[PDB]
């Protein structure tokens, strides 16, 4: 079903953990919730499920106001963050519990429990009680319980957090295959940036009770609305450099680099509400920084940290007149020493620019992938 | 260091011996010839007569004549098991359902009623038997099954003593993580289904406690059962053994045998309940 | 699946029994029972009717039982506290009047009688002992009130004297015959063997006054004290008395009387202290034992567990008296042992403090298994990983107990500990059986002792003390100490 | 409503209720009236409550002292036996069953404390209390002792305290004087002084109770004890060659033990008063009737002159009767409640050494006199 | 303190859950355990803790046997997988619990609690009970509790699993900062490959109870010992192909694809392994490999492309920097580098790569 939240507010006394949240999740839409730890991702899910009350505002599921409806009558299933498995019942019994409450046949139950358990690699653990399982196994049971139930609305609170990287990819596809088979609404919380990009039709970013930005995966990566979103999507984080406006054209802004040489550069970015002389913040991603060989803007400094990841190498560079280190990603293993001199190119069309209040000057460079 | 086991084993043994001593004097009284409240731990003159008559045997005495058992002590005991058994099952069932609503549901005056229950039960039961007799006398002519001189009436009379058991179960219910029943409700479980199929199997230790505490209460109870029961063959063991008590002297030997006998069903039930007194029932369910 | 119509059929069928019993209770002298059963049933049918009263479905069965067997007895006790209900005033007015109207006195002569069959009819003979004269009636028929003329005779009746069995079978009809002597004396059946001039001692006028037929003294109901009193009132008062309302009289009798207040505070302090120490010691011992006996390293725990609860498995009455024996100063094994090992014989009954110690020892013995059984169950609510975390934080057995086990138990224990305080506050039986309040508090006008609780000293005033059994006084003091223990729980 | 045409009887469970049922079976054979005998726990407490509402048994059997209370409550019918029937029983038992100068129950049996002695240790029992101290000294040389009885309860110690002029309430001529208590006078003081001196000279122990005394006699440790007829079967099992005799005299005057008269009251609400009267007078209170109950469980000394004379052939029963007649009838007045505690306290205070005999009995009188007045 | 295990075996009745494992961890060494879900990482960690018994074998912490020793005497702390927080105590009290036991110092406690709570960004949550906290917040309290106690050996069980990407970075750094300042042994269980590579002095790969390989982060990436290690280290998973002539210092095999190409490999029915990151664009390399696109995943920083090769049932994953416009069903060709290839035997063991990596 469709799930729509209008002016939803949640308060624990004077502490307001959800403020004026407005969301419109249409039927069959896969929506990923991301945000900093303790921003209110579960609180939202719990209000949707009916496990937490709403202070003010309205919630609609299938165009019916659900504020005062008991959890059982919501058509909502949830994969709890704490798993919340029935510790007195086995894996099989946990996954078959919802069907036993209905007048479901034993063979009907067994057919669709074994099927779901075999895709989660739980076929050998069917008789086990939750105490006799690992943390990643308990989590697969929690998912398996909700998968069997096949609700109108799927809620998954960080459902892969405790799995190995290889199994995490195997589960991602099986979840994605389900959504394409059933065409049902799925609201999915994750901290894994890869999950979010691969699974979502639409991503919601939260920041301490508020929705920061809603958009397509690439739409948030390429075009963040503000400084917060820009630093949250994509990991490693975006580099930020304090710059000064020197000149404006309608479709570009010229900024001065904080270095003693005060190098000037034009960026394809809106000049709307941008005054000459004002202090902006320049954003560039570690992936986007170029090798110095051929580059018009050169940033040189002293290497502070080298992280060897195998497939790539991350270099952290201390550049004078900027307090924060610059992070850069080279493909393959590149032999660099700590303390060595390193230079990187800075591409103008791939730069983001943010005002003093934090809002982004809309990037006007048409980046491939965004329709 | 396994000197801790040795010192515990030693201190428990000394504690057991100390607390057992008074009870061993009762066993001594039950096996002593004649009726004497005092004497040696191992009676100088041992007699099986008190246990013979309690177990239903006839006793031949010094002059030759045979004394048939004056009282059906074993039937009395069986009457005690029945009254205490059903009574306990009833108190468990009534206090558990009540606690569930107090621990999981919301209704106006929830906090007032719980504290009212604790207060009104802590009233001195001094003139209560006057009121109780008047109730069951009136009740008897409409529902005879639960009137005066019936086991039903005695059982019915105890089902009012639940206040504390409600608090005890409510308290235990509150230790169990709520997300288990939340998960259940999301699986489509009614509040009853969540109660029966999730909460109760994890609450099984405290249900045994309440059953035990009620079974003991009913086995040892005298005033109310004595007030309601008239027929000798319907007496519970606690009521029946009052016949050994007279204004000037007690038939200690027979009373003691009755006392030791009444402790037996307690022990059996206590042993059987242990299967429900288990650790780590909520283990592996909730991360935190 | 069970039908939806089946619910309204059952609720209709149960709603039928109500009314079938309610109007049936209304048919005879019940009313109080008919109104109370209505509100209770109507609440039950309403609660299960609409699904908005769902939560109450869980509470109703339990609250109904509690109201019936805990609350109702509570109201009556309080109700009785506003009346003079006692040994002296135990009957209702109607019963007291009924008793007085059955009272009789021998006004005339006393004749031994015999019954003699005359064909299908009967003949009644009387024998006058003090004159040696015999009287005999004509042939009569049994049935209803009738008067028989007796004539003096020398002859024997022709019939054979009837059995006691025949006299007994025909006793009702025989008790309605008024035999009349030649001299004009009326005589009726007084026993199964005698006819005499027995007559009612009092006769009811109608307005409410009873006049004595023997003395000529007139009596009227005095509802201020609850007796028939001579008449404007006279000195003489008739028993039995009847129950009557007295208002605050029973409550003020506790406040007005100096002398029953002299040892009040000193006893009150001991009651609180005795209760506090009991609860503390029973919780302490019980919790520790419960902890040790669930410890899996302890290999014999199953046997210990059973042996530890045996003081609670045996009825306490015999145990308390056995202790009374064990604690005897000159005899009894405890002081015989203490004289052998050490060199002392504690005055367990003579000395106030040592007596108080004895009382607490026996009570802890009586009360530890209760708390231990509670803890045995309550301990199962604590997860094992909390102790795994404490092991990783560097905790031992003692540290575990005080920083984790105790604080996780005191909260559920709190209501039980408050209850155990109130119960031991009123622990009448223990003190009576063991000490009788002994030793004696010297100079106490109304008998008070050192180990006496408030309940013990109080019910000595009400039930003993020489004024019969005053239930009205005991009910009023039961209410007062309840309001006192209610004010204590603050 | 008590049912007409039958008799319900309540009697305590240590009386011969099976014997009483057989007397009732004879009654039924001659009358057609079924007689049911019951022995419920705490019948003395149950009766007041059930009878108040016009229920309960037609006949209640209990000790006379409780019947004064029932009668005042208006629960007992006033009985009317003739002069000829009253001749059959001992005249002093009729005094026990009198509320406001009127008979309210039929006396059945008599119960009093007697002196019990071991024949093997003591062939000739002493006639005086003053003889004991000297006698204990020659028994202490053989390891034994003279006298051991229950010092804790005033019932057992009262006979000696009452000998020289101690009394509960002055029984003038039917009416008990509530304002005339005699636990303070010289007679009471000398009785308790002699008891204290027996403890002072180690002939007895201050904290000797019923259990310790009964065990000491049954094991043959003490030469004599003071106890009632309920204690005889214990001694029979012990096979101690024992005699029951008159209590020792104090200062020339006999011990005055309290007397308990088992009595039969008729419920004031019973529709079977005349049936009960016939059963009690002409069926129970005959040689044959009492023999039936006695054979089941011994009654001790009966009130019936004719059957008592046959029972008195047993020296123990004769001794019970003698101590009863030289003793004091238990007062059937509510004011006795205060007596029991105040007197019990007085002796404990005197024996342990908390108070002297003088002040201990003075305070005891003060406590009864001011409680009987209030 | 140093920690070493000798022939350590663990069984639940009969089923072996840790088979003959040998580990030597020197003092001041940061070791990370990795492996598939339910392989025995926590079990292993818990045996070191003392919370689980050791069936057979020897455990030494600081040159002394610890098998018989209770957990509280081992000088070890642990961040639990399931947090295992004290519910009756606040955040401040949860963190200051170990210090409160081992000689409480009022100032030292508050001072070290405030500083550790500052770096875990828990300062505003000190008065809260665990029930009034989020999952990630509880995880950080679990971490704080162990960091405050400062034990001889740190055992951390997936301690970042429930934290956002940006916070995870910040936590990694503070764990390293603490590791270099104290110089104490740390054993760290994680599923995050970035955490594994950047923290570890030594990585241990576990496989159904037994140790598969032990070596340097970069050593396990470039030179795995067997098929399993190669498939587990580095995500996405290394691609596998079921591959005639052998030389002295190099091995040649044939591709199963219909054209049947032969290629020499600098190594010692085989299984050829190639990583998605090592595959080259079409026009560059000599060994072209063509197929049909199945799945396209746009990750922002890069594009991952699944390619179905004729006669090869298993798909081929390719990684390329930046945003690449490719759709499903389209043709795609990739280069296959010979020197970057791995080779695996019939049983599973790898033929040692002789090509030296930087
Ligand atoms: C006045 C008190 C009278 C008590 C006398 C009772 C008579 C019995 C004699 C026994 C004497 C005690 C001997 C203690 C020796 C320790 C035995 C031991 O070493 O065994 C310990 C048993 O615990 C434990 O009760 C540890 C023991 C608890 C120690 C507490 C002692 C202080 C008692 C007073 C405080 C009571 C609290 C107040 C209540 C209101 C094992 O603990 P752990 O392995 O850490 O726990 C892990 C798991 O078991 C927990 O699920
Ligand atoms: N019971 C509570 N009382 C007060 N605050 C709470 C309570 N439960 C959660 N919170 C706070 O609300 C915020 C949101 O919680 P949650 O939705 O779990 O965060 P997340 O975004 O990690 O899912 C957190 O900062 C948490 O501290
Ligand atoms: N009580 C048990 N009985 C049998 N097997 C168990 C028990 N507890 C855990 N296991 C199994 O042991 C394996 C390893 O456990 P664990 O160390 O928690 O895995 P992980 O490597 O994910 O931490 C898991 O496959 C789990 O199923
Ligand atoms: O506290 C001493 C006390 O313990 C027991 O009383 C229990 C009772 O048995 C329970 O049913 C409940 O009412 O709690 C009481 C304690 O609070 C003993 O039965 C009793 O003898 C003793 O005094
Ligand atoms: O403990 V594990 O199953 O999450 O790797
Ligand atoms: O703190 V949260 O984002 O639920 O892991
Ligand atoms: Mg969350
Ligand atoms: Mg694990």
CSV table of C-alpha atoms in Angstrom, one decimal, chain B residues 87-248:
chain,number,residue,atom,x,y,z
B,87,UNK,CA,-7.6,-23.3,44.2
B,88,UNK,CA,-4.0,-22.8,43.0
B,89,UNK,CA,-4.9,-23.3,39.3
B,90,UNK,CA,-7.7,-20.8,39.8
B,91,UNK,CA,-5.5,-18.2,41.5
B,92,UNK,CA,-2.8,-18.6,38.8
B,93,UNK,CA,-5.3,-18.2,36.0
B,94,UNK,CA,-7.1,-15.2,37.6
B,95,UNK,CA,-3.9,-13.2,38.6
B,96,UNK,CA,-2.1,-13.8,35.4
B,97,UNK,CA,-4.9,-12.5,33.1
B,98,UNK,CA,-5.3,-9.5,35.5
B,99,UNK,CA,-1.5,-8.8,35.6
B,100,UNK,CA,-1.4,-8.9,31.7
B,101,UNK,CA,-3.8,-6.0,31.5
B,102,UNK,CA,-1.9,-4.1,34.2
B,103,UNK,CA,1.5,-4.7,32.5
B,104,UNK,CA,0.6,-4.4,28.8
B,105,UNK,CA,-2.7,-2.5,28.4
B,106,UNK,CA,-3.9,0.9,29.4
B,107,UNK,CA,-7.2,2.0,31.0
B,108,UNK,CA,-8.4,4.8,33.3
B,109,UNK,CA,-7.4,4.4,36.9
B,110,UNK,CA,-4.9,1.7,36.3
B,111,UNK,CA,-2.5,3.1,38.9
B,112,UNK,CA,-5.3,3.7,41.4
B,113,UNK,CA,-6.7,0.1,41.2
B,114,UNK,CA,-3.3,-1.6,41.6
B,115,UNK,CA,-2.5,0.4,44.7
B,116,UNK,CA,-6.1,-0.1,45.9
B,117,UNK,CA,-5.6,-3.8,45.6
B,118,UNK,CA,-2.5,-3.7,47.7
B,119,UNK,CA,-4.1,-1.5,50.3
B,120,UNK,CA,-7.5,-3.3,50.7
B,121,UNK,CA,-5.9,-6.7,51.0
B,122,UNK,CA,-3.6,-5.4,53.8
B,123,UNK,CA,-6.7,-4.9,56.0
B,124,UNK,CA,-6.9,-7.0,59.2
B,125,UNK,CA,-9.1,-10.1,58.7
B,126,UNK,CA,-10.6,-10.0,62.2
B,127,UNK,CA,-14.3,-9.8,61.6
B,128,UNK,CA,-14.2,-11.4,58.2
B,129,UNK,CA,-15.5,-14.8,59.1
B,130,UNK,CA,-18.8,-13.2,60.3
B,131,UNK,CA,-19.2,-11.7,56.8
B,132,UNK,CA,-18.0,-14.8,54.9
B,133,UNK,CA,-20.5,-17.2,56.6
B,134,UNK,CA,-23.3,-14.8,55.9
B,135,UNK,CA,-22.3,-14.7,52.2
B,136,UNK,CA,-22.0,-18.5,51.6
B,137,UNK,CA,-25.2,-19.2,53.6
B,138,UNK,CA,-27.0,-16.9,51.2
B,139,UNK,CA,-25.2,-18.3,48.1
B,140,UNK,CA,-25.9,-21.9,49.0
B,141,UNK,CA,-29.6,-21.7,48.3
B,142,UNK,CA,-29.0,-20.5,44.7
B,143,UNK,CA,-25.8,-22.3,43.7
B,144,UNK,CA,-25.6,-25.3,46.1
B,145,UNK,CA,-22.3,-26.4,44.5
B,146,UNK,CA,-20.5,-23.5,46.1
B,147,UNK,CA,-22.4,-23.1,49.3
B,148,UNK,CA,-21.7,-24.2,52.9
B,149,UNK,CA,-20.2,-27.7,53.5
B,150,UNK,CA,-18.8,-27.9,49.9
B,151,UNK,CA,-15.3,-28.0,48.5
B,152,UNK,CA,-16.5,-25.6,45.7
B,153,UNK,CA,-17.2,-22.9,48.4
B,154,UNK,CA,-13.8,-23.3,50.0
B,155,UNK,CA,-12.1,-23.0,46.6
B,156,UNK,CA,-14.3,-20.1,45.6
B,157,UNK,CA,-13.4,-18.4,48.9
B,158,UNK,CA,-9.6,-18.4,48.2
B,159,UNK,CA,-9.9,-17.0,44.6
B,160,UNK,CA,-10.2,-13.5,46.2
B,161,UNK,CA,-6.6,-13.6,47.6
B,162,UNK,CA,-4.9,-12.6,44.3
B,163,UNK,CA,-3.9,-9.0,44.9
B,164,UNK,CA,-0.2,-9.7,45.7
B,165,UNK,CA,0.1,-12.4,43.1
B,166,UNK,CA,-1.1,-9.9,40.5
B,167,UNK,CA,1.7,-7.5,41.6
B,168,UNK,CA,4.3,-10.4,41.5
B,169,UNK,CA,3.3,-11.5,37.9
B,170,UNK,CA,2.9,-7.9,36.7
B,171,UNK,CA,6.5,-7.2,37.9
B,172,UNK,CA,7.9,-10.3,36.1
B,173,UNK,CA,5.9,-9.4,32.9
B,174,UNK,CA,7.6,-6.0,32.9
B,175,UNK,CA,11.1,-7.5,32.8
B,176,UNK,CA,10.4,-9.2,29.5
B,177,UNK,CA,11.2,-7.1,26.4
B,178,UNK,CA,8.0,-5.6,24.8
B,179,UNK,CA,9.3,-6.1,21.3
B,180,UNK,CA,8.5,-9.8,21.4
B,181,UNK,CA,4.8,-9.1,21.7
B,182,UNK,CA,5.1,-6.2,19.3
B,183,UNK,CA,6.6,-8.6,16.8
B,184,UNK,CA,3.7,-11.0,17.5
B,185,UNK,CA,1.1,-8.3,17.0
B,186,UNK,CA,2.7,-7.5,13.6
B,187,UNK,CA,2.5,-11.2,12.7
B,188,UNK,CA,-1.2,-10.6,13.2
B,189,UNK,CA,-1.6,-11.9,16.8
B,190,UNK,CA,-4.5,-10.8,18.9
B,191,UNK,CA,-3.7,-9.5,22.4
B,192,UNK,CA,-4.8,-12.9,23.7
B,193,UNK,CA,-2.6,-14.8,21.2
B,194,UNK,CA,0.4,-12.7,22.1
B,195,UNK,CA,-0.5,-13.4,25.8
B,196,UNK,CA,-0.8,-17.2,25.4
B,197,UNK,CA,1.8,-18.0,22.8
B,198,UNK,CA,4.6,-15.5,23.5
B,199,UNK,CA,4.4,-13.9,27.0
B,200,UNK,CA,3.3,-16.9,29.1
B,201,UNK,CA,6.0,-19.4,27.9
B,202,UNK,CA,8.6,-16.9,29.0
B,203,UNK,CA,6.8,-16.1,32.3
B,204,UNK,CA,6.7,-19.8,33.2
B,205,UNK,CA,9.1,-19.4,36.3
B,206,UNK,CA,6.8,-16.9,38.0
B,207,UNK,CA,3.7,-18.9,37.3
B,208,UNK,CA,5.3,-21.8,39.2
B,209,UNK,CA,6.1,-19.4,42.1
B,210,UNK,CA,2.5,-18.2,42.3
B,211,UNK,CA,1.2,-21.8,42.0
B,212,UNK,CA,3.6,-22.9,44.8
B,213,UNK,CA,2.7,-20.0,47.1
B,214,UNK,CA,-1.0,-20.7,46.6
B,215,UNK,CA,-0.8,-24.5,47.1
B,216,UNK,CA,1.0,-24.0,50.4
B,217,UNK,CA,-1.5,-21.3,51.4
B,218,UNK,CA,-4.4,-23.7,50.8
B,219,UNK,CA,-2.9,-26.7,52.4
B,220,UNK,CA,-2.2,-25.0,55.7
B,221,UNK,CA,-5.3,-22.9,55.8
B,222,UNK,CA,-7.6,-23.5,58.8
B,223,UNK,CA,-10.1,-20.7,59.8
B,224,UNK,CA,-12.1,-20.3,56.5
B,225,UNK,CA,-12.1,-24.1,55.7
B,226,UNK,CA,-13.2,-24.9,59.2
B,227,UNK,CA,-15.9,-22.3,59.0
B,228,UNK,CA,-17.4,-23.7,55.8
B,229,UNK,CA,-16.9,-27.5,56.1
B,230,UNK,CA,-19.3,-29.5,58.3
B,231,UNK,CA,-19.0,-33.1,57.2
B,232,UNK,CA,-16.0,-35.1,58.6
B,233,UNK,CA,-15.4,-36.9,55.3
B,234,UNK,CA,-15.2,-33.5,53.5
B,235,UNK,CA,-12.7,-32.1,56.0
B,236,UNK,CA,-9.3,-31.0,54.6
B,237,UNK,CA,-6.3,-32.2,56.6
B,238,UNK,CA,-5.8,-28.8,58.3
B,239,UNK,CA,-9.4,-28.8,59.5
B,240,UNK,CA,-9.3,-32.5,60.5
B,241,UNK,CA,-6.2,-32.3,62.7
B,242,UNK,CA,-8.0,-29.7,64.8
B,243,UNK,CA,-9.8,-32.6,66.4
B,244,UNK,CA,-6.5,-33.5,68.2
B,245,UNK,CA,-6.7,-30.2,70.1
B,246,UNK,CA,-8.6,-29.9,73.4
B,247,UNK,CA,-9.0,-27.1,76.0
B,248,UNK,CA,-6.7,-29.0,78.5
